[PDB]
């Protein structure tokens, strides 16, 4: 549910960047891979994150596993929006995302 360890995962970014990025790095600063996560999970290209983008980031297949319940995802995204977002715009900005 968008935890500190979930964002700080080398295997996840290495799997996501496979194909698009032909540059496997050894070790990166936590801010660097969190920036990679934020840039990768913004599909619309508006430099912003919302509930749908967060839901896609959390509940995705990868390469079996049971699907998470809709109520749990709703609660997790509601908590994330209530905690990180302070401007009440609905979108999650990297300025707001830098707290966690």
């Amino acid at each position: 549910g968008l935890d500190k360890n979930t964002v700080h995962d080398q295997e996840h970014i290495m799997e996501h960047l496979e194909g698009v990025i032909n540059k496997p790095e050894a070790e990166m600063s936590p801010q660097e891979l969190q920036l990679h996560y934020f840039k990768m999970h913004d599909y619309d290209g508006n430099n912003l994150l919302d509930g749908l983008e967060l839901s896609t980031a959390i509940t995705h297949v990868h390469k079996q596993a049971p699907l998470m319940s809709e109520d749990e995802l709703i609660n997790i995204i509601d908590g994330v929006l209530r905690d990180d977002d302070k401007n009440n715009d609905g979108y999650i900005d990297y300025a707001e995302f830098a707290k966690s």
Partner: protein
Amino acid sequence: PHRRFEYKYSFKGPHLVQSDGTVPFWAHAGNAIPSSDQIRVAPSLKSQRGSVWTKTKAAFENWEVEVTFRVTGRGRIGADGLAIWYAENQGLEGPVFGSADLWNGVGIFFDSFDNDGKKNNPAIVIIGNNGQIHYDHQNDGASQALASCQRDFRNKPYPVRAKITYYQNTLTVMINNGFTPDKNDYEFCAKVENMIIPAQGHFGISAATGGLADDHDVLSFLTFQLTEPGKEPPTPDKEISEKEKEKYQEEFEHFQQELDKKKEEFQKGHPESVGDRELRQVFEGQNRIHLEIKQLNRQLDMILDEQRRYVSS
């Protein structure tokens, strides 16, 4: 006004559908075929009906929905058209644009077939209903039309964008004609003042197909809760200082530029067309001519209001 995007009443690509096969926070019924990038509410087969509604009811006083859709047909006549609804109950299947009749709420109909035979189609019709008057399907709801419009949304080169805003008990529908890929290019279509709708209800879309056949794809559906600047209570001492944001955003943009530069040499390191580019250039030139004429109109209105003040002197 101040807008807040509500994710629980929205869907968009390119990951619209999940591995389960259902739209998150949305229930679809009928012949709707949700996909990874769009929802085909009604395909181009004979006698098709589909609808996608919200699961949880939305409780807003001022809201705004931005709907992007394509209505594509082989012929020059549409089958039924699209319908966007802010209702009280999930209609699902029904006889009105693939949704149930006798709805308690508001409905915007993108009618593309002239049942009345008045040669006034395709047209956008806003109908409010308390749940006691049947929709006149054979007359395109002419008697129940609170406000009408006259636009063509079929076979456009670009997806057609509409914006429906309920603000201060006034419903405004502003529709892009689909001739440009720009998102914020809405043109005024219709408005209804002092219309009563239920305080809480379901957001839904629906489509149907009659004797002819059209494909009604919906690419996105974004809902924004609207609040007044004075009505929204501020929350002091909760936000972070602007110095930290300024320090962070410059390094964020520098790192994203560096990432783009890194992608530049690796996109071609490991392995549109003619005619399509020409058509895009033609449409861009038409849009530029339209924008220049709009600028001329604004300049001439400027000189008109300048000469207006010179009369009294």
